[PDB]
Subunit: 123 residues, 4 copies
């Protein structure tokens, strides 16, 4: 649900995700990573299922962050694909892909894969 | 500059991707899939490096599509992560993650992974 | 190390992994999954770095299980790629790919991706 | 039966894969990579469906290579998961995970993902 997704979330690495879920299925906010070639906040944009199933299923969503802001440019972008599970302890479970720009030759080693779990902070 | 990312692209499955790249890094557009539980167009939003390195490297980017529109709701979302290479034959080489909303018990098989290559041909 | 890897391991889904690490970098054993179209034990084969780095790095390894035994055939195979971290609480952290045989047409949806963490049981 | 998996295959990077498939599902052989921190041949072991479905589907399989041999030790291992399709032009279509041994702090960037297509050409 939008209200459930909107808020401040943190993951196991200590990164911060601030997001607003719009009525049209949109997600906008900023992301701050605790690791990597990144500093300060970066803009994020994404989409989510604004009409999930009426059962105990998670709400599918995803977002992207290109790691360029006014202070650094890492020449990379990460996309997180996962689901939102609301409740007393709401979590967003994801798997992500991080692609770095490379020459054709090194293209075989351009993408990392991992997974992150986010916990919502009260409010 | 010289990022002919804006345009209509097609992938090996015959899906169509129409995007606009903004000077500061935004990507907006619509996606139409030739396969799956989808029909007509869906809204996409992403980001790209608006200042790629000045060496022979590609431009990293990514975008998301939540598979809900006025015709169907597949309760899933796909994110594509990859890089753009321009020139005579410009291509966008990606790897994607498709997550469906499941119950806890089926969370272990909620995500598919694949790769798509787009061209303007 | 071989001695450290050899043993019985379980993951968060309740699946069992019994393995022997050979001096030549080989892994052989059986796997029993708590979920899926599987029943009883399946043979597994893999390899590991028999000469890791002398630091606090994990030992890279991977193994495969084709889901066919004398009782079922799911027409699929899973490969786990990860690292072994030994110590008092040794763990094997992995990411896996599960490919199902399909017709060319449905090949775009043939592979699932996930991650599993294994805990070693005493002995 | 009719699984011409045994043989010498090559992928788009020019790497060579020589494998033998056993009647009960084992795969054994050697791998030589044209890229990376590797040189000469490495041992591979895997498994495949020795009884694939009798419809027009491919044969699922997978194999592992730990990148250590008498010449180099890259402290990494790659696993390829995919399916074999035979016929005039037989191919093995895969997705792979390459994990390097890291310290805890760098565990978040320990794994690369990619895709390789093999042919006997
Ligand atoms: O190093 C880079 O190229 C940019 C920073 C990447 C940080 C990654 S994105 C996935 C993972 N989750 C995080 O919170 N941070 C890392
Ligand atoms: O079935 C669904 O859940 C919605 C359609 C999914 C279509 C996928 S997304 C990745 C791949 N690339 C495409 O162009 N279409 C498929
Ligand atoms: O359903 C199938 O095709 C065969 C069983 C798959 C079980 C998978 S493999 C990865 C994950 N980890 C487990 O312990 N079980 C599931
Ligand atoms: O650099 C290393 O760690 C060892 C060599 C890795 C080579 C990889 S494995 C996947 C891809 N396919 C190949 O044929 N080679 C690269």
């Amino acid at each position: 649900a939008e209200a459930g997704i909107t808020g401040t979330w943190y993951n196991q690495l200590g990164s911060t995700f601030i997001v607003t879920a719009g009525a049209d299925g949109a997600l906008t906010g900023t992301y701050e990573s605790a690791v990597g070639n990144a500093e300060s906040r970066y803009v994020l944009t994404g989409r989510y299922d604004s009409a999930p199933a009426t059962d105990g299923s998670g709400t599918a969503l995803g977002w992207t962050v290109a790691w360029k802001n006014n202070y650094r440019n890492a020449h990379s972008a990460t996309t997180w694909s996962g689901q939102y599970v609301g409740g007393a302890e709401a979590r967003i479970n994801t798997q992500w892909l991080l692609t770095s720009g490379t020459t054709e030759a090194n293209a075989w080693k351009s993408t990392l894969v991992g997974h992150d779990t986010f916990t919502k902070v009260k409010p």
